[PDB]
Design a protein around this ligand. Structure first.
Ligand code: E1I
Ligand code: E1I
Lengths: 122, 123
């Protein structure tokens, strides 16, 4: 017998995004071409297969500054990073290309799937 | 303006954070509760507790790796609330209601406290 708090997880994520906005306990800077992004490694690992792999591998686990592949563009990463901390994704025909490629690179199948559906729809 | 919202994202994030805790991956604090030690992520503690948010909002308190709770706090009560923080689920029983409530009040977790109040009424 347990009590289920329906909004707990969502409330936790809100507060994690609050901490991100004020740069509290952020422990990694993601560099994407010309832009810097600060985040929590734990959240990154919780939302991306790439980051889960990096931060559990003996080569890159302790890095505090990560450089994504040059082909990734900052606009797409910003979108997916905001999704990580909000569960919300702003998808349009003008950014779907970048969003889908970034999500495939970050290994985030749900966004990829949603992108594929968005394409075959329009 | 509008956007797509993934209804299960947050729950899966929390589950993966709990998996990292179980693996002791990127845990950055030890909470000492009488004779017991609990490892955790400050970020989750801050996101779930008014006490932990207040403590760790100080970068010098945030630098600490060992936090001793009030010695009067029951370790089983804290363990129940720690599991709750990482799962959204609270194991409330007649055998533990008093420890959970006192601990929830100490950690400044209103929803659990009020849940315990409703529980005590129903009993
Ligand atoms: C909430 C959310 C999460 C993810 C998402 C997160 N992670 C990383 C991840 O799994 N971390 C953890 C896994 C475990 N394990 C416990 C034992 O069993 C399960 C694994 N423990 C702790 C952590 Cl932290 C993803 N990894 C992949 C992937 C690609 N190749 N492989 C081999 C895996 N794919 C495809 C994904 O989608 C995601 C994506 C989205 C989206 N969109 C999303 O919303
Ligand atoms: C999901 C969940 C959360 C909480 C819960 C979490 N926090 C801590 C918290 O808010 N941290 C953050 C706050 C902010 N903001 C602060 C205000 O504006 C600027 C930004 N930014 C990031 C973070 Cl991390 C709580 N603090 C109190 C409390 C008691 N006195 N005071 C003064 C506060 N009470 C009563 C609570 O319940 C909770 C409890 C439960 C339960 N049960 C639960 O399920």
């Amino acid at each position: 017998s347990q009590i289920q708090f329906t909004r707990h997880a969502s409330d936790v994520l809100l507060n994690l995004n609050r901490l991100r906005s004020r740069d509290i306990l952020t422990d990694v800077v993601i560099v994407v071409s010309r832009e810097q992004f600060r985040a929590h490694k734990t959240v990154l690992m919780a939302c991306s297969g790439l980051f889960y792999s990096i931060f559990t591998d003996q080569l890159k686990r302790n890095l505090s500054v990560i450089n994504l592949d040059p082909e990734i563009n900052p606009e797409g990463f910003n979108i997916l990073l905001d999704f990580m901390y909000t569960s919300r994704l702003n998808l349009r025909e003008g950014n779907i290309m970048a969003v889908m490629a970034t999500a495939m690179y970050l290994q985030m199948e749900h966004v990829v799937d949603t992108c594929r559906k968005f394409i075959k729809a329009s």
